[PDB]
Design a protein around this nucleic acid. Sequence first.
DNA 1: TCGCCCCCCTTCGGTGCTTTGCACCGAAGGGGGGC
Lengths: 553, 406
Amino acid sequence: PISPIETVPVKLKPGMDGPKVKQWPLTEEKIKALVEICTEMEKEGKISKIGPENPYNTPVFAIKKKDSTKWRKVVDFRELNKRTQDFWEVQLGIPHPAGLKQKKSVTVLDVGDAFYSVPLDKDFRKYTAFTIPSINNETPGIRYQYNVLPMGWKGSPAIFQSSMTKILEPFRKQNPDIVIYQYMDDLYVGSDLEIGQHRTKIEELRQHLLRWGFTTPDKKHQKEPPFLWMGYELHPDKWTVQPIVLPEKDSWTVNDIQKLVGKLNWASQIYAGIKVRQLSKLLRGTKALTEVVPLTEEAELELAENREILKEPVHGVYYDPSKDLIAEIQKQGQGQWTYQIYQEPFKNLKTGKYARMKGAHTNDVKQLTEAVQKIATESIVIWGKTPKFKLPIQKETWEAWWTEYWQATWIPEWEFVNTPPLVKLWYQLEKEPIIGAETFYVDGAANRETKLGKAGYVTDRGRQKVVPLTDTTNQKTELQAIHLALQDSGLEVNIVTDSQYALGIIQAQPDKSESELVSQIIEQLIKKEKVYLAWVPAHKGIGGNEQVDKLVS
Amino acid sequence: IETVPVKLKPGMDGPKVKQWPLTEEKIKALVEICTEMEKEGKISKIGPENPYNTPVFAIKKKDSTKWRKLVDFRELNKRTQDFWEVQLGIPHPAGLKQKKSVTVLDVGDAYFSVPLDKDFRKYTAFTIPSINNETPGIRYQYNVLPQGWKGSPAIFQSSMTKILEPFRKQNPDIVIYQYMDDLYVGSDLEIGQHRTKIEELRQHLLRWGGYELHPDKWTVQPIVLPEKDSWTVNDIQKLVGKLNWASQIYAGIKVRQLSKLLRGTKALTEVVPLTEEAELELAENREILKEPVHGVYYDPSKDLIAEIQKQGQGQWTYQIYQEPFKNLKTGKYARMKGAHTNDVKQLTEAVQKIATESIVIWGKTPKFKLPIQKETWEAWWTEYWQATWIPEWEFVNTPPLVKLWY
DNA sequence: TCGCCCCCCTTCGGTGCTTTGCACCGAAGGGGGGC
Ligand SMILES: Nc1nc2c(ncn2[C@H]2C[C@H](O)[C@@H](COP(=O)(O)OP(=O)(O)OP(=O)(O)O)O2)c(=O)[nH]1
Ligand SMILES: [Mg+2]
């Protein structure tokens, strides 16, 4: 059936015309698959025969459906899509089973031939012209246009979703205590009514849908747990992901590793402690998806750990609005973080992970804050509120950070949880100079034209050094001058630089960095006992600074 | 009524900005506000064939604990034609900053009685999200002058003058200035007498359709130099680097006879006696910092910029300028909620206060340079926003070299 | 040989700075998952 709902008016982008691209050859099995779909689509009014007055064309093909017997007709509208107006997409995100509440009666329904039940704007139909080949040359193919939403057109999903929202709105308004999760044409319907009254409401919803042209075939009509929904299995008390099968290969290509990492990220939503840093590093610097990449030892270990996690059964629970949300985070090493969101202990709603490297230089406290922010955003999306946090960072560590760090920062209500390794600052810089400690005046300079440079220092105890540097930069020289002062000094030091750049990096107390030079400076800062670091402007003849500025010349 | 023809600036398209996630209580407030607005025909439900979008959220001032819908039309305003070109703009009275008390009124509802150009309505679309994406977003567009749109005070202006003429005739000494959805209304009356005539202005409005500021206490915080009895090498290179930086703002500031009082490669903790020729240079520069800079004047043709530095213990310094190092105003913001522990709330409140001062003083808000990570700001700032306008901002990570402003 | 959505990890290129590389950030490549 075709919905009597009003068509949505759609336009081509200004100055553009329609697509004119020839059909390609296809197999006999797919030609008769399409002839069966097409001649029956014409009898249902989904398409109409067109002639030469219509100059447009676009190629069509067919792919299999998860129910193996059925075929899906699909059109390669890439050209028409480019020329079609933009849309504002109404699908804002993906519903998650951890956001569902427990319901006494649950149904899952699916609309049959959903896109084909929504009419297409009449003035637009001529641009959907296509041709079914039929063994390619015994005949010039038969030509049709769509009267309904085609699969493969850029506008079809949003127009369907918007139309489905309009059709459902009268039923939702009349039935506020029935939850209808609406994802494309898939409808999850939960209620606290007894099964008898629930089925009454379902028949009423199905009849309402049918009067608007939306069938709900019995094949796609689930009434008994477990419900198959959005890639999950819904039980009354719990939910699971549908089985995740990891690729198992003797030789791995780039593309295989890419699929493995993706499967693992998907699993990380309910399997705690998944890691993908070492497998992901294997993708860096590769140049072809078919390039063979040997697994490093670290990636094999990571893979083996993930496989042990994946063999154990897991389940999520459903959301209880009357209880707090709690998010707990653990540090895993090398900028990797894993978390669990629960309301009652040892009953996770869902899990996840955070492992992005943001910025060239950072520290664990910053990354913990990023994890907190990711979890906060995800909880707003799924539950509409943020959770209480349990974090492996002492309250004094945090307070030391947000007072000596010059940017505003914050973490919401959180509780310390002692799950080592704890998040900590790996060194602090003295607010005042240190009595009895050596004073280094450092400087470096490089020649931008010749990439040759020099780094060195002078000292109040009369110590001076100068090192030549090849293939450097202006900024690298200054980092090197600090490198050497830390290298040649005792446990307590006072350092004076004229590099705002270098001071800026070190003052933020980074504990890791994409640069090996900064990495080395960090290791030396961590080994020191006290370090005061001070700045003065360059090329103004200031005592100590001017002397080392002269020496590096 | 007949609508005013409105256009975007040449070569520009409408806003296309994604809706961000909303808490449950903001979504429910929006659903009830928008449903009611739709019944009254101020907005219409639209579909995805309108390709434009602007984020929507909601705020709740607590000493008026009902929700206020806030659409972030900052993008649409940047792309909307100027009404200065159409000569429909509002002028700013120079007397408002002279008043001792200024009350802010939200008059955004007056716009809803004027229809919007039918060809412009599509640019005002917004989308209400859905908890756990239970549904697709629900889309609306305005049929009337929207709150927060640059064009609404301009189109409504002559109507606003007719509404206010009887009140400012009866009160020639009170100054009222419209900025977007707000009226800034200043007077010199006793605090309870000021509030009484605010309530009279409110009810002359209710017949057609905040807290007290004080311009009188917005102290300017100058660059200060430390006062000690004895001075280390470190104290003096911290003082010289600070003055060398101030030499870009002030005129005739020298460090030559303090520069090389640090002569030689000396220890940072070594006490250096001040020469008579350094005490001479120090107090001279100290005065030059006591009196304001000569030659800095506001230019209404240019945007205002605001910088903020976090100083600690709830203290926040700020400068407002249009050209680098020519500060029209320097200041210091301090707050004590009593919780004592939210940097993002403090910065968000500092931004509203500074922006409010620019409205009172110059009639527009500055573009803020915010000392915060973009993602930290965006995780939380709407939880603390209480104004009906939103200023422009960007994010900067500038480590302090000098502590110039403290 | 198709479409729309969210997620993560890598790569690339535009922007602005009182720069000469550098750090930041958005977009596009790959992958997962949904219909
Ligand atoms: N262009 C395109 N659209 C798809 C695809 N898969 C699903 N959709 C869209 C179009 C479908 O009509 C809609 C619902 O997906 P279904 O698998 O339920 O297919 P449909 O309802 O049309 O047929 P059905 O009777 O349920 O087997 O979602 C796809 O692979 N390509
Ligand atoms: Mg279907």
